Amino acid sequence: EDSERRPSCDIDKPPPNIELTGNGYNELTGQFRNRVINTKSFGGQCRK
Amino acid sequence: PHYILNTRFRKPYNVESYTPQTQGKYEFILKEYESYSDFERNVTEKMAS
C-alpha cells in the first residue's frame, strides 16, 4: 500500500513489442512462437 | 503493464501472449481477353445470249 522510494521512477512506457523479440523462433517453418524470455520484468533496476 | 500503440492494456489470466504484427500481404490479379472474327463474301455472275 505505502509504496515509497519512488516506484518505477515515473517510467511509463516500455519498448513497443519487445515481447516479439523475446518470443521463441522456429527455423524450418519461418514462423515465430510463444514468449520464452520474460522481458516485462525489471528486477528493481530501473533503466530509463 | 502492457502498452500497444500508446494504449494501456492489461493481459488477462487466460491469454498467454498477444503481440501486434504487421503481416501485410495483398494480391491482385487482372486478366483480359478479346477475339475478333470477320467474314465477307460477294459473288457476281452475269450471262447474256
Swiss-Prot record, chain A:
Full-protein interval shown: 120 to 167 of 843
Quaternary structure annotation from Swiss-Prot or TrEMBL: Monomer or dimer; as a C5b-7 complex it can also form multimeric rosettes. Component of the membrane attack complex (MAC), composed of complement C5b, C6, C7, C8A, C8B, C8G and multiple copies of the pore-forming subunit C9.
Cellular compartments annotated: Secreted; Target cell membrane
Family in the record: Belongs to the complement C6/C7/C8/C9 family.
Modified how: C-, N- and O-glycosylated. O-glycosylated with core 1 or possibly core 8 glycans.
Origin: domain of life: Eukaryota
Organism: Homo sapiens
Record protein name field: Complement component C7
Annotated disorder: Complement component 7 deficiency: A rare defect of the complement classical pathway associated with susceptibility to severe recurrent infections, predominantly by Neisseria gonorrhoeae or Neisseria meningitidis.
Cystine bridges: C9-C46
Region of interest called Disordered, as start-end residue ranges on this chain: 1-24
Protein function: Component of the membrane attack complex (MAC), a multiprotein complex activated by the complement cascade, which inserts into a target cell membrane and forms a pore, leading to target cell membrane rupture and cell lysis. The MAC is initiated by proteolytic cleavage of C5 into complement C5b in response to the classical, alternative, lectin and GZMK complement pathways. The complement pathways consist in a cascade of proteins that leads to phagocytosis and breakdown of pathogens and signaling that strengthens the adaptive immune system. C7 serves as a membrane anchor.
Species classification: Eukaryota, Metazoa, Chordata, Craniata, Vertebrata
Gene name as annotated: C7
Skewed-composition ranges (Basic and acidic residues): 2-13
UniProtKB/Swiss-Prot annotation, chain B:
Location in or out of the cell: Secreted; Target cell membrane
Record: glycosylation sites: N42
Domain of life: Eukaryota
Post-translational modification: N-glycosylated; contains one or two bound glycans. Not O-glycosylated.
Entry similarity comment: Belongs to the complement C6/C7/C8/C9 family.
Purpose of the protein: Component of the membrane attack complex (MAC), a multiprotein complex activated by the complement cascade, which inserts into a target cell membrane and forms a pore, leading to target cell membrane rupture and cell lysis. The MAC is initiated by proteolytic cleavage of C5 into complement C5b in response to the classical, alternative, lectin and GZMK complement pathways. The complement pathways consist in a cascade of proteins that leads to phagocytosis and breakdown of pathogens and signaling that strengthens the adaptive immune system.
Quaternary structure annotation from Swiss-Prot or TrEMBL: Heterotrimer of 3 chains: alpha (C8A), beta (C8B) and gamma (C8G); the alpha and gamma chains are disulfide bonded. Component of the membrane attack complex (MAC), composed of complement C5b, C6, C7, C8A, C8B, C8G and multiple copies of the pore-forming subunit C9.
Pathology linked to this chain's protein: Complement component 8 deficiency, 2: A rare defect of the complement classical pathway associated with susceptibility to severe recurrent infections, predominantly by Neisseria gonorrhoeae or Neisseria meningitidis.
Protein name (database record): Complement component C8 beta chain
Full-sequence range covered: 202 to 250 of 591
